[PDB]
Amino acid sequence: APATVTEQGEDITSKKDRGVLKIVKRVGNGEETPMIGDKVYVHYKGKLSNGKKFDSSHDRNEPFVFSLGKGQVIKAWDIGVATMKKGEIAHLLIKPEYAYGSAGSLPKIPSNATLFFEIELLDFKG
Numbered sequence: 001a002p003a004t005v006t007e008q009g010e011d012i013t014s015k016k017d018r019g020v021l022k023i024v025k026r027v028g029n030g031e032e033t034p035m036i037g038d039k040v041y042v043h044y045k046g047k048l049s050n051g052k053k054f055d056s057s058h059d060r061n062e063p064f065v066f067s068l069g070k071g072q073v074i075k076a077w078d079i080g081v082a083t084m085k086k087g088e089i090a091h092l093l094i095k096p097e098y099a100y101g102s103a104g105s106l107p108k109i110p111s112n113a114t115l116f117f118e119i120e121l122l123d124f125k126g
C-alpha cells in the first residue's frame with residue numbers, strides 16, 4: 001500500500017517535492033472541501049512505513065477532531081485534508097520534512113520517519 005502511492009499518488013505540495021503523495025480510494029460527495037479554521041471530523045489509520053508503530057482513531061471508538069490550517073497537526077494533514085470532500089477516503093505517503101522531520105517525536109515517532117495514513121473525512125464545520 002505505501003508503494004502504490006509512490007507509483008500512482010498525486011503530489012499535492014506547493015513545492016512539488018513529492019513530500020505528500022495522495023490517492024483517492026473512495027470518492028466523497030459534491031465538490032466542497034474544508035477551509036482554514038474549519039473544525040474537521042475524521043477517522044484515520046497511520047503507520048511508520050519502515051517501522052513498528054500503528055495508530056487508528058477506530059481504536060478509540062470516536063472520530064479525531066481538529067481545526068484546519070492552524071498548525072494543530074503535521075503539515076501533510078493541513079495540506080491533505082484541505083483537498084478532500086465530505087465522505088472521501090484517501091491514502092497519503094509523507095516524507096519526514098512534512099511530518100516530524102529529523103527530530104521525530106520520541107517516544108512514538110523516530111527521526112527521518114516516513115508516514116502513511118488512510119484518512120476518511122466524515123464532516124467539517126466553519
Ligand SMILES: COc1ccc(CC[C@H]2OC(=O)[C@@H]3CCCCN3C(=O)[C@@H](C3CCCCC3)c3cc(OC)c(c(OC)c3)OCCOc3cccc2c3)cc1OC
Pocket residue numbers: 046047048053054055064071072073074075077099100104105108109115
Ligand atoms: C512539528 O512537529 C509536530 C507537528 C505536529 C504535532 C501534533 C501531533 C498530532 O498528530 C498528527 O499530526 C498525526 C495526524 C493526526 C493524528 C495522529 N497523528 C499521528 O501522527 C499519530 C502517529 C501516526 C502513526 C505513527 C504513530 C502515531 C500520532 C498519534 C498519537 O496518539 C494519539 C500521538 C502522536 O504524537 C506525536 C502521533 O501522540 C498523542 C497526541 O495525539 C495528538 C493530538 C493532537 C495532534 C497530534 C497528535 C506534533 C509535533 O511535534 C511533536
